[PDB]
Structures are given as structure tokens and as C-alpha cells.
């Protein structure tokens, strides 16, 4: 444990204490909190998020170029089953150069992702909804499209936020995600029990505007014995409709 007792041992001509066995095990950068309770992972990606009003609640926009990398092993197997490449090794060689990618390969990827979901995460992950599952819809373009109703649970804006993508690999992972983690199956807060995916911003704005009623000042509460008198009074332009 360096520095524990006495002057910390340093390399010559540096103030940096040398990193001892104790420093490796402990702390934020330590073995436990860096490589053991959390890790960097394969089959993941990240990009800028963009709003996607046209999506259904269970969907996300996924750039095709991102999807090709995340599913690359799947894409290689599928490219052999149909026929774009003789075998797995040659197929990978074709994706390496971007001009060597033909258009049939994009149709090949579409077959692969059918029914599978991906995970969206946005940091900070404050509660269990910082990660939700979405079925991806391939898009041209470099941006992730996020469904409007889920922005609240994620505390997402479009002021330049980015999100991370993860691919659950096994049949077991995919099942857990589609049943337990699907955005549409978590509609209520685990904290308060109240609705989480709910109208906000424009959605509220539109619905309030069409359901509000006019109240006009021209008539100003006159009495009329017969209703046919009233319509006549309005026809004179003495009394407003509402």
C-alpha cells in the first residue's frame, strides 16, 4: 500500500505516486468499481437522438450503418444462407470496403433483425427506465430516432443528447427484453405507481386546443322568452353565438 505510511514512492523526476497493489484494488478506478461491477461491452454503439413522431410506442429509428456493425456476425451467416457471398470469410471481406457493399446486403440485414429488439440507454441512468427495449426500424442517416412518449423516463431532449445501443444476443436475453423491458410493457412508474408514458408538450397542447370552448362577451346574458326570438336576435348581430 504505497503512500499509506510515509512519503509516497515516486518515479524520479515526477510527482506522481506509483500505483501499488492497494490502489489497483480500491477506489472509483479500482478493480472492483471499474472492471468487476461494470465493464465496457461488445455489440454496442452510440449516436445523437432525434425525435420520431411517426414511430409506434415499441419502436426506434436505427441507422442502417450502425445496425450492420451490431449484427455483423448475424449478417455474415445470413449472407451465406441466401447467396451474397460464398462463405463467412469472404462475406466479411466485402463489408470492409464501403464501396464493395452492394444493395442486396441491406435486404439481407432486414431479414436478420426481424422480431429482435435492441436496448436504448441514456446516461445518467437514474431508475430502471434509463434502459428500455425497442424493435429497431432501419433508416438512412446517422441519427437514432426516439419515440416521443418515452422522452420523460429518459429525461431526454433533442438539444443534442446521445443514446447508447446494445444488442441482446441469446434467445434468453431477447425474451427478457421483449417481455420485461419493452417500452410498451412499462407504462407506469415503479416509484409512485402513476402513468410514466403520458401526454406532454405538443400532445397536451393539441388536445387542450380542440377541447376548449369559446366564451364570448357580445350577448352579455340577455333573457329571451322564446328560442326563436334568440336566433332572430343573433341574426340581427346583437348577440354572439357562444
Amino acid at each position: 500500500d504505497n503512500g499509506r505510511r510515509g512519503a509516497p514512492v515516486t518515479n524520479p523526476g515526477s510527482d506522481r505516486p506509483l500505483r501499488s497493489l492497494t490502489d489497483i484494488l480500491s477506489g472509483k478506478q479500482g478493480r472492483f468499481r471499474q472492471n468487476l461491477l461494470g465493464k465496457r461491452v461488445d455489440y454496442s454503439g452510440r449516436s445523437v437522438i432525434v425525435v420520431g413522431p411517426q414511430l409506434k410506442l415499441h419502436q426506434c429509428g436505427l441507422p442502417k450503418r450502425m445496425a450492420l456493425e451490431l449484427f455483423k456476425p448475424f449478417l455474415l451467416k445470413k449472407m451465406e444462407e441466401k447467396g451474397i457471398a460464398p462463405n463467412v470469410k469472404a462475406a466479411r471481406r466485402m463489408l470492409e470496403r464501403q464501396r464493395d457493399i452492394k444493395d442486396e446486403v441491406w435486404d439481407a440485414l432486414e431479414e436478420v433483425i426481424h422480431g429482435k429488439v435492441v436496448l436504448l440507454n441514456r446516461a445518467p441512468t437514474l431508475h430502471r427506465l434509463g434502459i428500455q427495449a425497442f424493435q429497431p426500424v432501419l433508416v438512412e442517416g446517422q441519427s437514432i430516432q426516439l419515440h416521443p412518449l418515452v422522452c420523460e423516463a429518459f429525461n431526454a431532449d433533442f438539444d443534442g443528447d446521445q443514446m447508447a445501443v446494445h444488442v441482446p444476443l441469446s434467445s434468453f436475453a431477447q425474451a427478457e427484453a421483449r417481455i420485461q423491458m419493452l417500452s410498451a410493457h412499462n407504462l407506469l412508474s415503479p416509484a409512485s405507481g402513476e402513468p410514466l408514458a403520458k401526454p406532454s408538450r405538443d400532445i397536451i397542447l393539441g388536445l387542450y386546443y380542440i377541447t376548449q370552448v369559446r366564451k364570448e362577451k357580445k350577448g352579455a346574458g340577455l333573457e329571451f322568452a322564446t328560442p326563436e326570438e334568440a336566433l332572430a336576435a343573433h341574426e340581427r348581430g346583437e348577440v354572439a353565438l357562444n
Binding site: 500500500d1 492497494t22 484494488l25 477506489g27 472492483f32 468499481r33 468487476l36 461491477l37 427478457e176 409512485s192
Partner: protein, 145 residues
Amino acid sequence: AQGVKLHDKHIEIVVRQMMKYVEVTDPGDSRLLEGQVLEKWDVEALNERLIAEGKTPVAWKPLLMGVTKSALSTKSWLSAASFQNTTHVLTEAAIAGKKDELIGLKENVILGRLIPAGTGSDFVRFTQVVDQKTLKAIEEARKEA
């Protein structure tokens, strides 16, 4: 006051962990020492073995500790050593010859195991699926000598 609707249900879970531990006032007829701190569960478990052995049971006191101290005291030394105060936790554990039974989540996360929650709980873990065709097929051959 800050306008946050939150169920008491959650705060009670945490407070329950704050009260997890007790301090011995008299051991009576046990190996414990006066002033020794231990989980309330373990001393309740011990006391029914003593009251069933007839010897005088252990006298204990409710003990309230904040979340940090409570977190550092759980039996699992992998949980405590991954939290904080890593050297202290680890030196006392190595002396005691402590065994982590891998009860909680963090222990299993560290080993890369399938956690004891969700699809990993022993309640749902072993559930089998079989189609009526296969259920009856296996069933007919075995109902005989």
C-alpha cells in the same frame, strides 16, 4: 414538499436494513460477548436453538445504524469490499476466514454469475416446457415394465 409522489413502500425497505443489527446485553449461556454486534436474524435463529436446548437465551438490544455502516456490515465480504473501506473490510474478512455464500446481487455480478433475481430466481429458474404431443409420447413408453 418538493412535489415528488413516492410510495412509503420503498423508504420502508431501506429503513428495515437500517435496523438489521443488534447489540448483546447478556449472553446468558452462549458463545457471544456483551457488546458484540450481530444481525437480528442470526441472534433470533440462535435464540430458538437455545430456548429449545433449555439454556438461558441471549439478551439483545435494537440497534440503529445509517446506510453506510449497515452496508459495510453485511455478512458478504464481496459486497462490503466492493462498496468502500476496501482494505479494512478485506483485512477483517481474511482474519475471520470469512465465507461469502453469494446470497446477494453484487457478489454474483462480480463473479459474472446469473443473479438471484428475475429469470435467475430459484422460484422460476427450473420451469420446464413440453408440448402435449411430446408429453403423451414420453408417457406411454414408460408406463410399463
